[PDB]
Design a protein around this nucleic acid. Structure first.
Lengths: 129, 116, 100, 91, 117, 58, 178, 103
RNA sequence: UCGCCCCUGAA
RNA sequence: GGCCGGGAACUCAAAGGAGACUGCCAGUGAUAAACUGGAGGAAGGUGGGGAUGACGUCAAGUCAUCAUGGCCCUUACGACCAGGGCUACACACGUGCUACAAUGGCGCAUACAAAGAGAAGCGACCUCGCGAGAGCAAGCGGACCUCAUAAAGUGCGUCGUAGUCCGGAUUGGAGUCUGCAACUCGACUCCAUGAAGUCGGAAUCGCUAGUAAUCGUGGAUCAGAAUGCCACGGUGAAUACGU
RNA sequence: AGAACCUUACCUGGUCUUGACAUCCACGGAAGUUUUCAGAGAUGAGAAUGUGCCUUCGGGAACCGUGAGACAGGUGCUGCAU
């Protein structure tokens, strides 16, 4: 059993435990800070902003265990993991997360290579006259 | 193979399938679609003798689509045969009659015990 | 590939069974494969060279039921056109078209 | 040579020639089908007639053909450009 | 300095500038500099009265420049005098590799142009 | 070509396989060849009965 | 031929502007689909602008770009009744796109080190119309305002005008433009 | 973690065969052993080919295959004197691999 | 409105 | 250190279900279908992607995968072997890949992957080698172990717009591996040599989103050869008035 | 879906002719095992060794070589016979 409040974070090959611990503290991901698990990157800073848009750390303390998938993808599953753990409290929250698209799973994700195609929609060129 | 052996006794060609389809539709089947390659009479033209009777959708994923081939090897050339019988129409044979497993509906997932 | 082309390879695999034994380790680790124990001698020379066609080098894999070294699929012993045919009737079990 | 694994190949079709070319010397340029032959400094100074599928053609081997296969020192093909041979080679 | 090779270029790091005195490529540059304790994070316009001394000293220990450039080409010409495949093909402007002559070998024969088939 | 013969999953989980067997890592090839060979001689030496279809279970 | 609405892109707020407009200015300065390497230049050049000019963080781009954008773009289509290619008064959204694009194009006409310093100094000269990226404006907008024959295809349209009430001069076309 | 002492490897191609097999034998597995281990699905070992569909030319169209080979486990834990039953005597092959060992 | 031709045969 | 016990909650796997149907709300639309917004929801309006590629036409291709009517060869056109040729070559065309650089190169340190593969195999560990790799050897037919160290990316050091610190062709010498043996006709590495090219006319082609772009990874074939094909993930757009 | 030889159909040379690969007929020998020489090997000629399955003990069965034909083989030619 847990002692937490849960929200499931599945985005883009990165699946994430996201555990809300009551009371103000600091966001903790894998016994590190946010900007230490995602480092000093430029990209990381941009995806910090939608988590402060839904409001992070003001009555909240967390423990997160995301693993697998991308770097941006990891942060994506966190973003879809705290929203699912925030819509539980009130349904007015739910609405103002779905209108923000961040409790809505971004279903976009790599499409298979197929035969007769160079890539996933790229194809050979012609100049054969 | 029945109608193929018939062609190899040099009797019936076009007419072969027709007899065997009045049979097949009388009892059994839910539509048949035969293909036979025309080579009859010592004629030296590539032809397609194609006769159906009753419904054969080729794309039904909830029906028993039968399919086998035969080939004659006459002195008139080689006559391919294809018989597609639509035995099912709403009942599979491996989309029906099977046992899956799990959901066993037990709230406890057994674990080793003791502590050390 | 034709019957005759096939036939060649049969005989080469015959010789395989008369030149892989002690004669296996001899061609491999003892006298080849990153130098030798103390050898690389006129000994080694005669013994390796004369069974030319027991080598897996001299053998080019192909199907036993239709031949052709191109379009071959070693892992299940199949080749090009004779994959589809069988598989459709379900005569290769569990082999089915992509649906992911 | 182009390459060697660690060293050269004495060759078994050259083995027979060396052992009888110290007992009688050359006696006709040595008809050898194999082009995988590589020679000692004890086997230089001879007319080694390596094949090329066209003819056995003699090569009066030197010390710089030691550790080198002898195929490379003979015509490997027949070819010509759009010119005659008296001042150029294209064979 | 003047050194065994040609006159030093300046305004470039030591490793850099050493590749431009030939018979010395990428590796051999930094390899000499490392050995004699010469820094390669400093330029030859930042050359010191220490580094200059060992400069001339170390380059005299290896075969480089014109001397090297001689030797190498003598062995390209060795093979030519043997009637070798590798030999003769170099005066036909042709590679000695698996490299195609059908479409490629336009480094060997220079830029393509319409000419006899 | 004109008909591409769609039957590759009509005999999948829509109707049973006609040669159901299993093989392990180095057995794949062997089991394949052996089965098909038998069937050739089999089907040929039987013609006094009207063959619905041979199947094997290994 | 085209069915239903076009796609809309939802993109992130910037971590130094909060904007999606100047997030679209990182997007134009992306190459090889890397937002990482893009974001570098953006901020590097923002500072260059702030020093070399007065302005503000939302005037170092914005104001400068509102002097590069024309309000009419001339597109293409063979028909014109004179084989003309018609002016098209562009929507305010497409205004943005034009100027943004051109400023990055202008930094590939430069060789003045980095890429930040290039587009920065360019944008500093682009708010007083003394740049070289504001001279691109002066051919699109110069053309359009000096020559017009509108979006009517003159022969086809004239027949339509005549039928409706009797005219030869410009009006809405009742009949086909096919 | 928690470790099992009996492991059985039930391995067939089709899930419409492997789970017919599992249900007939994990039934008996209940009374076998001193504690039950149910059937661990495990991630599928998967193969998939692409072979040319035409006897000559072409590359625009090739036949696309898959062939998932599922690997179920039946499992028991704690060896008893009745482990012999559900292991070999009540689990037999038919075109489904049966492991006759505890690994 | 933007000229603009030319194409051996039996399935 | 999920490294050990414990806990099966959670992710995960993958079998089985729940779900989306213009079903519901309003308008529009003949009160018809439908269309446009809305709500609920993870998702609305063939949801996205596969399989799905009709009856046919092209006497289209394929007697060389295989089958087969006729024809021809019969101390052979058959059969087997050693060598050579398929990788010629003065060129032309098609399809790719790599550059022409600072959004970058090189040096330092550093971030996270997915999906497959494997006892003719991959091979940790430890030892040596500049390296490729070799020796020593555990493990592994496996959510075990190994291939595997993901790479672009990122924080710093530098270089400064030079045909160069860009770029990498060519050749030589020295080495490696896999093989009976690597000479025409194997790949890898080492050092040297250091190319053309400063971003490509006429023209022509692809692409409306996780697509394009770009960066790696794996697989089959394979004793031993991927800029190919096939597959997997990372980062990740511009533009669409309008036909 | 990787062409070092082989692959390979192609060439040049070596070599065989009911045959490398099939059945049947007749004969002998069970097939093989380790080694020698010549040759480029293909092979050709040996030197020793093996006597399983059945037997009437010869013979056969698998199988090997040779002989003889009926044949065999052909990625040889026609996709305007299929």
């Amino acid at each position: 059993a847990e002692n937490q409040y849960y929200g499931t974070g599945r985005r883009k090959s990165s699946a994430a435990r996201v555990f809300i611990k009551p009371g103000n503290g600091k966001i903790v991901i894998n016994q590190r800070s946010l900007e230490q698990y995602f480092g000093r990157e430029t990209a990381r800073m941009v995806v910090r902003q939608p988590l402060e848009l839904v409001d992070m750390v003001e009555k909240l303390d967390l423990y997160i265990t995301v693993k697998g998938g991308g770097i941006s993808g990891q942060a994506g599953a966190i973003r879809h993991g705290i929203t699912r753990a925030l819509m539980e409290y009130d349904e007015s929250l739910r609405s103002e997360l779905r209108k923000a698209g961040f409790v809505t799973r971004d279903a976009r994700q790599v499409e298979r290579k197929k035969v007769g195609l160079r890539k996933a929609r790229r194809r050979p060129q012609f100049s054969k006259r | 193979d029945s109608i193929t052996s018939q062609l190899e006794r040099r009797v019936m060609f076009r007419r072969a399938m027709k007899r065997a389809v009045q049979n097949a539709m009388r009892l059994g089947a839910k539509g048949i679609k035969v293909e036979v390659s025309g080579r009859l009479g010592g004629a030296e033209i590539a032809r397609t003798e194609w006769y159906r009777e009753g419904r054969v959708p080729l794309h039904t994923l909830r029906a028993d689509i039968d399919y086998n081939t035969s080939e004659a090897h006459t002195t008139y050339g080689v006559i391919g045969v294809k018989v597609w019988i639509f035995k099912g129409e709403i009942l599979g044979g491996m989309a029906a009659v099977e046992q899956p497993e799990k959901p066993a509906a037990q709230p406890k997932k057994q674990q080793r015990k003791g502590r050390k | 590939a034709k019957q005759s082309m096939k036939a060649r390879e049969v005989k080469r695999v015959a010789l395989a069974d008369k030149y892989f034994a002690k004669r296996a380790e001899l061609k491999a680790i003892i006298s080849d494969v990153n130098a030798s124990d103390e050898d690389r001698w006129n000994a080694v020379l005669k013994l390796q060279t004369l069974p030319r066609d027991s080598s897996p080098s001299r053998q080019r894999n192909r199907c036993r039921q239709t031949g052709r070294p191109h379009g071959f699929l070693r892992k299940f012993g199949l080749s090009r056109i004779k994959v589809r045919e069988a598989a459709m009737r379900g005569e290769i079990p569990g082999l089915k078209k992509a649906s992911w | 040579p182009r390459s060697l694994k660690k060293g050269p190949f004495i060759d078994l079709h050259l083995l027979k020639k060396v052992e009888k070319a110290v007992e009688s010397g050359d006696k006709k340029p040595l008809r050898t089908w194999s082009r995988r032959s590589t020679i000692f400094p004890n086997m230089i100074g001879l007319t080694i007639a390596v094949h090329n599928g066209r003819q056995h053609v003699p090569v009066f081997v030197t010390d710089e053909m030691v550790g080198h296969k002898l195929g490379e020192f003979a015509p490997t093909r027949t070819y010509r450009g759009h010119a005659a041979d008296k001042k150029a080679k294209k064979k | 300095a003047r050194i065994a090779g040609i006159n030093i270029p300046d305004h470039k790091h030591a490793v850099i500038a050493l590749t431009s005195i030939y018979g010395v490529g990428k590796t051999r540059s930094k390899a000499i500099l490392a050995a004699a304790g010469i820094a390669e994070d400093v330029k030859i316009s930042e050359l010191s009265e220490g580094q200059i001394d060992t400069l001339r000293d170390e380059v005299a220990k290896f075969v480089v420049e014109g001397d090297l450039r001689r030797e190498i080409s003598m062995s390209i010409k060795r093979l030519m005098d043997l009637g070798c495949y590798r030999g003769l093909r170099h005066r036909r402007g042709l590679p000695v590799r698996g490299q195609r002559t059908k479409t490629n070998a336009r480094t060997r024969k220079g830029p393509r142009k319409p000419i006899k088939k | 070509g004109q008909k591409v013969h769609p039957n590759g999953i009509r005999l999948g989980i829509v109707k049973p396989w006609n040669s159901t067997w299993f093989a392990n890592t180095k057995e794949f090839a062997d089991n394949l060849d052996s089965d098909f060979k038998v069937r050739q001689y089999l089907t040929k030496e039987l013609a006094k009965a009207s063959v619905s279809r041979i199947v094997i279970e290994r | 031929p085209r069915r239903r609405v076009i796609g809309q892109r939802k993109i992130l707020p910037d971590p130094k502007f909060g904007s999606e407009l100047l997030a679209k200015f990182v997007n134009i300065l992306m190459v090889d689909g890397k937002k990482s390497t893009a974001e570098s230049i953006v901020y590097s050049a923002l500072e260059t602008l702030a020093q070399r000019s007065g302005k503000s963080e939302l005037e170092a781009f914005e104001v400068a770009l509102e002097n590069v954008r024309p309000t009419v773009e001339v597109k293409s289509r063979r028909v014109g009744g004179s084989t003309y290619q018609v002016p098209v008064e562009v929507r305010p959204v497409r205004r943005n796109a034009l100027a943004m694009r051109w400023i990055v194009e202008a930094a590939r006409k430069r060789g003045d080190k980095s890429m930040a310093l290039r587009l920065a100094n360019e944008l500093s000269d682009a708010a007083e119309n003394k740049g070289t990226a504001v001279k691109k404006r002066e051919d699109v907008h110069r053309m359009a305002e000096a020559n017009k024959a509108f979006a009517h295809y003159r022969w086809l349209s004239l027949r339509s005008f005549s039928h409706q009430a009797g005219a030869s001069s410009k009006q809405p076309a009742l009949g086909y433009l096919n | 973690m928690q470790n099992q002492r009996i492991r059985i490897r039930l391995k067939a191609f089709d899930h419409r065969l492997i789970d017919q097999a599992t249900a007939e034998i994990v039934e008996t597995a209940k009374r076998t052993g001193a504690q039950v281990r149910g059937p661990i699905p495990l991630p599928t070992r998967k193969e998939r080919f692409t072979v040319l569909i035409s006897p000559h030319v072409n590359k625009d169209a090739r036949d696309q295959y898959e062939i998932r080979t599922h690997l179920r486990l039946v499992d028991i834990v704690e060896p008893t004197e009745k482990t012999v039953d559900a292991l070999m005597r009540l689990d037999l092959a038919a075109g489904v691999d049966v492991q006759i060992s505890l690994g």
